[PDB]
Amino acid sequence: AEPEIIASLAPVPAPVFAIPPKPADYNVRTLRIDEATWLRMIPKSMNTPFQIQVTDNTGTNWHLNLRGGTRVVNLDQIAPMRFVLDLGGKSYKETSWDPNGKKVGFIVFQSKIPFELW
Amino acid sequence: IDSAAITPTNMTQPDVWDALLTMSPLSAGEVTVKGAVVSEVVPADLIGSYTPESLNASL
Amino acid sequence: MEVCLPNGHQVVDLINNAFEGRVSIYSAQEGWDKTISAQPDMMVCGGAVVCMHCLGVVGSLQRKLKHLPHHRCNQQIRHQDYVDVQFADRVTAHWKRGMLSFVAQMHEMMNDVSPDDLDRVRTEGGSLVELNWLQVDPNSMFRSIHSSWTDPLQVVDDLDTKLDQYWTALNLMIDSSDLIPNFMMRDPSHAFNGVKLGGDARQTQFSRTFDSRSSLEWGVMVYDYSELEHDPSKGRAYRKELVTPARDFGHFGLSHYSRATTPILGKMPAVFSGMLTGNCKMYPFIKGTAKLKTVRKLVEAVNHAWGVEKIRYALGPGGMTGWYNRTMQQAPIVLTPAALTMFPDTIKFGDLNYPVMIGDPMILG
Amino acid sequence: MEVCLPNGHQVVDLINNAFEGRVSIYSAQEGWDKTISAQPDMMVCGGAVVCMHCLGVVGSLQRKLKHLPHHRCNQQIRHQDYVDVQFADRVTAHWKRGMLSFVAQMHEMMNDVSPDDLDRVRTEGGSLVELNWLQVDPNSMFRSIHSSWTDPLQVVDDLDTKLDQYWTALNLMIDSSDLIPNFMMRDPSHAFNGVKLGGDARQTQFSRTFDSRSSLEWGVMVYDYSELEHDPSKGRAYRKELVTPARDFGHFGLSHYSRATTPILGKMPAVFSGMLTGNCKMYPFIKGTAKLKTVRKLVEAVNHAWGVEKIRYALGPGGMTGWYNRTMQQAPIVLTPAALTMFPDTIKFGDLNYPVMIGDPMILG
């Protein structure tokens, strides 16, 4: 257990202090921005959705829509990591949208403008 | 995402984030505090400095 | 006993509770009571008790406290650093009391109005009731020069319930009688800009916030519908089809929209939440960034007093300044009551058609 | 570096993408582009890059690839093993482009219909638009006798969105004007079996798939309603109450169902998704078992050129042959788009009423 390490009063290197970690679970939609410092939101009342086109590694093009209330994860200062997403049990059903047969994916943006001003 | 353009009236959900996310570190030499990486950590100052909400929302 | 700094969401909760004026203050002279002004010692923020002399967490709400606990205090925090929050809280409390007085006076006059008068006013348009503008708030901040913010608060019970009941009764009576009041606005922002001022009111200044570097003494502001009742082409049918609030806001009996009032007191519009939400609550029309600005001095005081590692481990990434900037960026989402942004969008009668002047409140059919 | 075999769901995804006509194929001379046919080197199956020389998983979609990575490839798989999938993909692409050409010609011409003629058509029935079937994609392999599936693909950008816009506009004006088309079917399976054949069409041979042996050079089929117009008892009101598609499929705007077309091109019926799903997507009417038939030779090659324990650990219980049998059992849902099973249950007009003949498409009324 290493009592002197766990009770030091001076800075300790991260490789020395660290131990094998464990996975964690979250639900991004139900989190709160004030507590979660790694989440960014497009502020509401923006109320004018805009379309956009993005190409994948192979070269195929895809269409996405960005509106007010969209959340992203700040990928800076969070260390190498792996994300797995599961949508089992949700509905995502609307009058003019049937989820069966549709496609979902991860999109990564690199930009110089803060995400809130988009 | 769709190969064709999506009419903004048909789709109203901002995203598909209403799901379950599993997050796993890919290294054992980095440590984060309140969601940001630090090179060194002082153990004595981590005592009594975490609310339940912060601990739940931590990395 | 060592102590630790509070957290960001706790500070945000403190700011919110200050701006709806329910922050609990502990002073050695007065205990937990807040009727008599005194130098604060601890406050409750985010469900944690914090000592003002060090801004350190000393306890919580789970266990009762009868005195200031024995602890190590740096005593590096001064009253000038956090006087702003106390000022905002006290001003909000006084404003709430004044609004309650005005509303209850209006409702009691409503009850005193005679049924034959109701019948006559419903038959042909006329001024059902009017109140002279001098009586409201005789000795408060907003209508006197002698009073000050240090003055004792006026003691009332179940203030929120009284506000809800009186406001609901008044609105139901107005909707039943198809009346027209001169003190309700469709959009509070039109009070700050978008309305023509009359009766000298052109000289007013709207600080749009409760602050020390401004004057809170001013007269009551009401709409001018004299020409509205003057025009012979206008008929009671037109008044009921367009000028009646229920036509634009909707039936208060079944509506989730929030109502607003003219800057009666302190040059500050009041917003009442819709009844369908569960209850009617009154909120001042204040901007989130203006709310956030009150802790600028406290940020510097904390940076001077506490240590870098403690600040980083408590507040979060970037320290106190980083938290300040991030909360500035996210101010509209978090530092905003829900009722403040849930106003009706479609407007028919229009909130900008007649001037606003200092005069006697009056309602008509 | 050694490699491992892909998985069953990945192979199913590959089959689905191949039969929908979107498979990323990398060739040495051309790259990731597919305009010019060549020998495939690697293809994307369910998010995994697979080397065609030895069917090994060499990469993924998460990192960019510019060349075939250095790896130990057994070089035991020949072009004959997987030529079938490439043939199906290219044939699907050509068919989609030809169908878009046909539909856009229909849209532009029946838009060029004049308003007075349209009104006269509403008043009494008539042939609004007529296109010679010789004008429908002359240079396609389905029409031209000197065009092969190896010919370059026509460059059509934003293909699916253009197709959706044209199809939606066409159907909207059709059901707004209550017109009668000749190239739509209530049930596409009747074309394969259940519709009376015209004199010239009595020699038709339906392969019901896209295969090497089948001959895809054939004429353009349309329904025959000349006797419908010549029918004395037939009136415009009767056409509206029965012959109108909206009477059975439902109104295009509020219809969650799927539309079907006659074998216009390549003797293969097409199916269009409705508005309520979200958009119009076009699929062929190929059965899932026919799609699954294409990988039998690939299964044989893998069994011949891979270790039994590797196959068991990668594909699953029973080996790759067991996977083939299980997928054959499970085909009706795993290898079938949901659109293909959303056809109208009951049709009062019927789809076998009148014969089908190879001739000029028209929109009549």
Curated annotation (Swiss-Prot), chain B:
Q: Which domain of life is it from?
A: Viruses
Task: Return the domain comment text from this UniProt entry.
Answer: The C-terminal region, phi, determines both targeting to intracellular membranes and induction of apoptosis.
Q: What does this protein do?
A: Major outer capsid protein involved in host cell membrane penetration. In the endocytic compartment, outer-capsid protein sigma-3 is removed by cathepsin proteases, which exposes the viral membrane-penetration protein mu-1. Both myristoylated peptides mu-1N and phi are released during infectious subvirion particles (ISVP) formation in the endosome. They associate with host membranes and mu-1N induces permeabilization and delivery of transcriptionally active viral particles into the host cell cytoplasm. Seems to induce apoptosis in the host cell.
What organism is listed for this UniProt entry?
Reovirus type 3 (strain Dearing) (T3D)
The UniProt similarity line reads: Belongs to the orthoreovirus mu-1 protein family.
Q: How is it modified after translation?
A: Cleaved during the endosomal proteolytic disassembly of the outer capsid. Mu-1 is proteolytically cleaved into mu-1N and mu-1C during the maturation step to generate the ISVP. Cleavage of mu-1 to mu-1C is dependent on myristoylation and binding to sigma-3 protein. Mu-1C is further cleaved into delta (59 kDa), and phi (13 kDa) segments during entry into the host cell cytoplasm.
* Gene for this chain: M2
Q: What is this protein called?
A: Outer capsid protein mu-1
- Subunit info? Heterohexamer of three sigma-3 and three Mu-1 proteins.
Residues carrying a glycan: 10, 56
From Swiss-Prot, chains C, D:
Pfam families according to UniProt: Reovirus_cap
CCHC-type zinc finger positions in the chain?
51-73
> What GO terms are given for molecular function?
protein serine/threonine kinase inhibitor activity; RNA binding; structural molecule activity; zinc ion binding
User: Keyword Nucleotide-binding on this protein?
Assistant: no
Q: What is the effect of changing residue 354 to H?
A: In strain: Isolate D-EA1 and Isolate D-EA3; altered susceptibility to proteolysis during virus disassembly
What modifications follow translation? Cleaved during virus the endosomal proteolytic disassembly of the outer capsid.
SUPFAM superfamilies in the cross-refs: Outer capsid protein sigma 3
What biological processes does GO assign it?
regulation of translation; symbiont-mediated suppression of host innate immune response; symbiont-mediated suppression of host PKR/eIFalpha signaling; symbiont-mediated suppression of host type I interferon-mediated signaling pathway; viral life cycle
> What domain of life does the native source organism fall in?
Viruses
What Gene Ontology cellular component terms go with this record? host cell cytoplasm; host cell nucleus; viral outer capsid
Q: Which family does it belong to?
A: Belongs to the orthoreovirus sigma-3 protein family.
Free-text function comment from the UniProt entry = Stimulates translation by blocking the activation of the dsRNA-dependent protein kinase EIF2AK2/PKR, thereby inhibiting the host interferon response. Sigma3 prevents the activation of EIF2AK2 by competing with the kinase for dsRNA-binding.
Complexes and interactors:
Heterohexamer of three sigma-3 and three Mu-1 proteins. The RNA-binding form is probably a homodimer.
Q: What is this protein called?
A: Outer capsid protein sigma-3
Give the source lineage, highest ranks first.
Viruses, Riboviria, Orthornavirae, Duplornaviricota, Resentoviricetes
Q: Which gene encodes it?
A: S4
